[PDB]
Design a protein around this nucleic acid. Structure first.
Ligand SMILES: [Mg+2]
Ligand SMILES: [Mg+2]
Ligand SMILES: [Mg+2]
Ligand SMILES: [Mg+2]
Ligand SMILES: [Mg+2]
Ligand SMILES: [Mg+2]
Ligand SMILES: [Mg+2]
Ligand SMILES: [Mg+2]
Ligand SMILES: [Mg+2]
Ligand SMILES: [Mg+2]
Ligand SMILES: [Mg+2]
Ligand SMILES: [Mg+2]
Ligand SMILES: [Mg+2]
Ligand SMILES: [Mg+2]
Ligand SMILES: [Mg+2]
Ligand SMILES: [Mg+2]
Ligand SMILES: [Mg+2]
Ligand SMILES: [Mg+2]
Ligand SMILES: [Mg+2]
Ligand SMILES: [Mg+2]
Ligand SMILES: [Mg+2]
Ligand SMILES: [Mg+2]
Ligand SMILES: [Mg+2]
Ligand SMILES: [Mg+2]
Ligand SMILES: [Mg+2]
Ligand SMILES: [Mg+2]
Ligand SMILES: [Mg+2]
Ligand SMILES: [Mg+2]
Ligand SMILES: [Mg+2]
Ligand SMILES: [Mg+2]
Ligand SMILES: [Mg+2]
Ligand SMILES: [Mg+2]
Ligand SMILES: [Mg+2]
Ligand SMILES: [Mg+2]
Ligand SMILES: [Mg+2]
Ligand SMILES: [Mg+2]
Ligand SMILES: [Mg+2]
Ligand SMILES: [Mg+2]
Ligand SMILES: [Mg+2]
Ligand SMILES: [Mg+2]
Ligand SMILES: [Mg+2]
Ligand SMILES: [Mg+2]
Ligand SMILES: [Mg+2]
Ligand SMILES: [Mg+2]
Ligand SMILES: [Mg+2]
Ligand SMILES: [Mg+2]
Ligand SMILES: [Mg+2]
Ligand SMILES: [Mg+2]
Ligand SMILES: [Mg+2]
Ligand SMILES: [Mg+2]
Ligand SMILES: [Mg+2]
Ligand SMILES: [Mg+2]
Ligand SMILES: [Mg+2]
Ligand SMILES: [Mg+2]
Ligand SMILES: [Mg+2]
Ligand SMILES: [Mg+2]
Ligand SMILES: [Mg+2]
Ligand SMILES: [Mg+2]
Ligand SMILES: [Mg+2]
Ligand SMILES: [Mg+2]
Ligand SMILES: [Mg+2]
Ligand SMILES: [Mg+2]
Ligand SMILES: [Mg+2]
Ligand SMILES: [Mg+2]
Ligand SMILES: [Mg+2]
Ligand SMILES: [Mg+2]
Ligand SMILES: [Mg+2]
Ligand SMILES: [Mg+2]
Ligand SMILES: [Mg+2]
Ligand SMILES: [Mg+2]
Ligand SMILES: [Mg+2]
Ligand SMILES: [Mg+2]
Ligand SMILES: [Mg+2]
Ligand SMILES: [Mg+2]
Ligand SMILES: [Mg+2]
Ligand SMILES: [Mg+2]
Ligand SMILES: [Mg+2]
Ligand SMILES: [Mg+2]
Ligand SMILES: [Mg+2]
Ligand SMILES: [Mg+2]
Ligand SMILES: [Mg+2]
Ligand SMILES: [Mg+2]
Ligand SMILES: [Mg+2]
Ligand SMILES: [Mg+2]
Ligand SMILES: [Mg+2]
Ligand SMILES: [Mg+2]
Ligand SMILES: [Mg+2]
Ligand SMILES: [Mg+2]
Ligand SMILES: [Mg+2]
Ligand SMILES: [Mg+2]
Ligand SMILES: [Mg+2]
Ligand SMILES: [Mg+2]
Ligand SMILES: [Mg+2]
Ligand SMILES: [Mg+2]
Ligand SMILES: [Mg+2]
Length: 99
RNA sequence: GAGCUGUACGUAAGCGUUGAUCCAGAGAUUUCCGAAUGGGGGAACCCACUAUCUUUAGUCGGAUAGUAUCCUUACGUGAAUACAUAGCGUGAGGAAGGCAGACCCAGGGAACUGAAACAUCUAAGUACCUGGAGGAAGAGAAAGAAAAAUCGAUUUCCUGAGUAGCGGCGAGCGAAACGGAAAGAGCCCAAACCAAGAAGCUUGCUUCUUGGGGUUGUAGGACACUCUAUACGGAGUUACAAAAGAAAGUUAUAAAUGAAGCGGUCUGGAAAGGCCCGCCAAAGACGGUAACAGCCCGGUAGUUGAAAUGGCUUUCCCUCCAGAGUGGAUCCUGAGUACGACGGAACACGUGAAAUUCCGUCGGAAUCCGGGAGGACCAUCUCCCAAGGCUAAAUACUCCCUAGUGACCGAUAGUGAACCAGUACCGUGAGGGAAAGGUGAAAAGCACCCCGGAAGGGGAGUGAAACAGUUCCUGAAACCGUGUGCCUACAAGUAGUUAGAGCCCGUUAAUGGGUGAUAGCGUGCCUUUUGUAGAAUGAACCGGCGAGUUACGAUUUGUUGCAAGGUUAA
RNA sequence: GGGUAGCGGAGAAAUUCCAAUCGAACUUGGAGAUAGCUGGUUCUCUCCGAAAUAGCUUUAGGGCUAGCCUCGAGGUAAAGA
RNA sequence: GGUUCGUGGUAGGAGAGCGUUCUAAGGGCGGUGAAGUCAGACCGGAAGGACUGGUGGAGCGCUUAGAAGUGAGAAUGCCGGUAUGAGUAGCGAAAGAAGGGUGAGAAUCCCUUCCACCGAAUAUCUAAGGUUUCCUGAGGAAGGCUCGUCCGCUCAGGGUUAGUCGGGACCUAAGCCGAGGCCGAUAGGCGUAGGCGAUGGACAACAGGUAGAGAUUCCUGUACCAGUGCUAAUUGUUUAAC
RNA sequence: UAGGAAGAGUAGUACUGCCCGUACCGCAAACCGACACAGGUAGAUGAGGAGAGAAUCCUAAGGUGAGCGAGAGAACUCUCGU
RNA sequence: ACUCGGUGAAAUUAUAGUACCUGUGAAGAUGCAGGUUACCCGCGACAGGACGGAAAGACCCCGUGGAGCUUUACUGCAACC
């Protein structure tokens, strides 16, 4: 996966195409990403110990990784990513000669 | 290089950039049963002995190591029996069992079937049982093939050829050499002779061990002399003798880097699609992503990379090494064998005119002035030296691993098994042996209200769709129902067809559709039969599945190429 | 609790019993044994269209040759009715 | 394109075609709705082919060739589903009645009283065999030939105590295995020493208590068998207690 | 008896004694019969009246009322009584 | 058995709006011809027909089918002399 937890994201396709957000979790076992404010769902949950009043809950749902491009940190555009050896560790370098 | 504690949701409790989970190489641990091996046993259990250590005041308990049988070989003991042997004990090596339902070598070895019956024959040295291996096995360096001339170990393929032959001369069985190819490789002993030991002393001999020599058919060798070489040179663990160690390179087992569109716009739940524009390409393989993507993701072409272990190839190291000529006086060249009689078998070859090879039982040679073969046998000629052993490649198969391919299947198909399948179930047992795939892009898997004990419903909500609500994509037919337009309670009916009023509708628009009072005619489908409505056979109904195919030969017709020529096989 | 096993065992004898099976158990294989016998064999139209006879047959409800059908090609002193 | 003669047909011969799956090339349509499925009064000489509308929600035709697992109404055909007989036969030996209780619901569950049946058994133990069926708290989909609030059914937690009972560490019978050994194409068969093997031989515990589930086992009282150490006397020591 | 022998018994005290089975059914709805099946299943105990008796009828201790019912009282079939 | 409440099969089955007489026919007809009868739908009963159901006749014949048995059938084998 080219996207990790804590990065900034621009969504490319889907019903919520064209917006931005910050990744909250990653599921590399199944190629899913959870981004705040994207792909909200309404869960009909019974009352229980969690959320004692129950009711309809409005929470995010995971989306596929391919629907996500990592925005350029300095300029602010989605871009493909490349790897360079800086120091003794591999860093991620954009296609606009950035980080 | 950022998440992780499997399938498996979940709660709980935790660990991770001081680098976790994960991937690859090398190690450590490895309960009990099972060859099972200390004894026993009804599988995974029971009971021990001998030494050392250990706890208790001591019994009781614990830990560690050894203890099966057979073969080979050393040492010690040691009976009838005097020496001695058998037996007994100790030590050191080896074996045992499994399987890949494949391939192949040996021992033993059927029947159904065909012959239109059957016994010789066939099926067939097949199925099967047993033993032995190997990654291949078997065969293999002429006592050969053949003929007016030659070849030069074996194996496999194409031809020879369905030829020569065998055959109750029936059904059938059926070669080989020459010729063309793949692959190619040659060697080691026994015996004469020499040197040393001990022994029977078969007593001045022989007879065993050890080492050297030497292995062939124009005969070779021993034996004698002329030459050189004792590492000058050569060879090697795939035969030719055998065991180790390094250096380099390559490869197999994890991986790294890797170009170009978030282009605009339309429909849409969502764009990879339509239309209009760009770019990359040694990369337009494949898969995923909310519908069909070279430019979104994992990747692809290309270029890189291995700490560790294995394979392979060279080099070093290491090891080991005599080969030519001439005379050949004299000696050696595989004995209870080669052959022969009798009884069988294998050879394409069934006792036949029966050569060749092998087994059981009897008899039984020559040995270089010698021996065998050339399909009975004799003479001549030609070829060749048995009764010892080893040897890679070309060939057969696939339980497996890696990378791919298909005018191969697509859930009654394809493996018996796409799913916790040799399972459930059946049988005392060996053994037999199933059924069973699909919500959605994402659980967003229906909060809340109402009827009910619940199940199940009606709203509401999510979703593009709930007539996608947990056999959940599609959802045919048999079968079971609800509503209705036309007909039906004086009628004798293979249920229809032709004529036809009345009533009800309105089409792929044409001398249309539905139902039908009444009238004429009319004994189902299949199979098998001289002949069936048949009181002859089969089918309860619906659905799926279910029967002239392929390989190699023969013959005849059609088409195409060449034509007294045509055509290649491996 | 044990012994006898199928080319075999046991039988005061009946072809009697050997796991609801016995004039020769059950299971797997040879094996898709063989069947001159019965059953079945799936779309359509066009043209032609029989035989149920002779001889031989371990033959008689099977087969072979001839007779009858169909398709293609030939040659005439035209041979058929 | 014309003239003449023809066109019933089983076994059977000959010819021309339709339709299905897959492949190759050309050319196409399809989220503005593909295949499949349902309904129509359309077209062709037949097998068959379109068009329109509903359902469906992602693939499919056309042209010319090629290759076949190539077309089903019948095989007492194989597998699946669903009918008719039909609300029919049956519901597996037997005596029940009423009153209270529980519950959404009671002939069928619980309690009480009366009645009835077995009684060399339909009673009490205990081997084989079964393998959790035992007890408690919940449950009512399926099983129970009806019903069920119940159950040998479903779910979750529990429950089996030994020096003396039965069996091993004791013994042997029939039988089985069997070092060496004898026999035999292989495999193996037989068998000596030795050993396994109860249905038999020997061997030390009795009486009460136990309100969810064990009792010669746990608990109480009183015992026995084998062995060990610690104390106190006794005796014996290599013509030699034991 | 062969053998082993310098320790031996006696009395009192305290301590040690391993493994396997143990629930429940067991003439039965829990075993063998495909079934909650009128069949089959070894052994010990097995009371009273009358009686020779473990026969026979009625009962004790103890255990049961049998897993479809109610109501009518036809033919016919089965098991019984005159 | 019969009526009522609960539960609920099976063999069979080409589709059926399924009369009688005399005749015809593969020679014994609910279904063919000519006549004679007969309003529609059931419940309890009886067994004359559906050449009724079950079991590819066991009697009979056939197959160049099988198996068990016999002997002075043919050819063999063990065993024994
Ligand atoms: Mg072995
Ligand atoms: Mg025979
Ligand atoms: Mg025969
Ligand atoms: Mg073998
Ligand atoms: Mg070899
Ligand atoms: Mg042969
Ligand atoms: Mg890229
Ligand atoms: Mg676009
Ligand atoms: Mg879609
Ligand atoms: Mg001979
Ligand atoms: Mg001989
Ligand atoms: Mg000769
Ligand atoms: Mg020759
Ligand atoms: Mg000759
Ligand atoms: Mg050899
Ligand atoms: Mg399907
Ligand atoms: Mg299958
Ligand atoms: Mg079983
Ligand atoms: Mg899905
Ligand atoms: Mg509900
Ligand atoms: Mg629908
Ligand atoms: Mg779908
Ligand atoms: Mg339907
Ligand atoms: Mg009238
Ligand atoms: Mg009328
Ligand atoms: Mg009309
Ligand atoms: Mg005929
Ligand atoms: Mg006839
Ligand atoms: Mg009839
Ligand atoms: Mg017939
Ligand atoms: Mg029938
Ligand atoms: Mg043929
Ligand atoms: Mg030609
Ligand atoms: Mg027995
Ligand atoms: Mg036996
Ligand atoms: Mg035997
Ligand atoms: Mg006998
Ligand atoms: Mg008799
Ligand atoms: Mg008897
Ligand atoms: Mg055969
Ligand atoms: Mg056949
Ligand atoms: Mg005609
Ligand atoms: Mg015949
Ligand atoms: Mg003929
Ligand atoms: Mg004439
Ligand atoms: Mg015609
Ligand atoms: Mg034809
Ligand atoms: Mg298709
Ligand atoms: Mg459609
Ligand atoms: Mg087919
Ligand atoms: Mg059918
Ligand atoms: Mg069926
Ligand atoms: Mg009836
Ligand atoms: Mg009744
Ligand atoms: Mg009853
Ligand atoms: Mg009551
Ligand atoms: Mg009584
Ligand atoms: Mg009695
Ligand atoms: Mg028991
Ligand atoms: Mg049981
Ligand atoms: Mg249970
Ligand atoms: Mg209970
Ligand atoms: Mg219930
Ligand atoms: Mg019930
Ligand atoms: Mg229970
Ligand atoms: Mg006690
Ligand atoms: Mg005991
Ligand atoms: Mg005992
Ligand atoms: Mg032995
Ligand atoms: Mg023995
Ligand atoms: Mg003995
Ligand atoms: Mg014993
Ligand atoms: Mg006993
Ligand atoms: Mg005792
Ligand atoms: Mg109890
Ligand atoms: Mg007690
Ligand atoms: Mg009991
Ligand atoms: Mg039972
Ligand atoms: Mg009952
Ligand atoms: Mg019973
Ligand atoms: Mg008395
Ligand atoms: Mg009495
Ligand atoms: Mg009482
Ligand atoms: Mg009752
Ligand atoms: Mg009745
Ligand atoms: Mg009733
Ligand atoms: Mg007839
Ligand atoms: Mg007549
Ligand atoms: Mg008549
Ligand atoms: Mg009539
Ligand atoms: Mg009636
Ligand atoms: Mg009748
Ligand atoms: Mg009949
Ligand atoms: Mg018959
Ligand atoms: Mg015979």
């Amino acid at each position: 996966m080219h996207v990790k937890k804590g990065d900034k994201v621009k969504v490319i396709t889907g019903k919520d195409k064209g917006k931005s957000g910050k990744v909250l979790a990653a599921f590399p076992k199944k190629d899913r990403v959870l981004i705040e404010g994207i792909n909200m769902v309404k869960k009909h949950t019974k009352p229980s110990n969690i959320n004692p009043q129950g009711g309809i809950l409005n929470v995010e749902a995971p989306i596929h990784v391919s629907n996500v491009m990592l925005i350029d940190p300095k300029t602010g555009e989605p871009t493909r990513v490349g790897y360079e050896v800086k120091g003794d560790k591999k860093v991620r370098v954009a296609k606009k000669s950035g980080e």
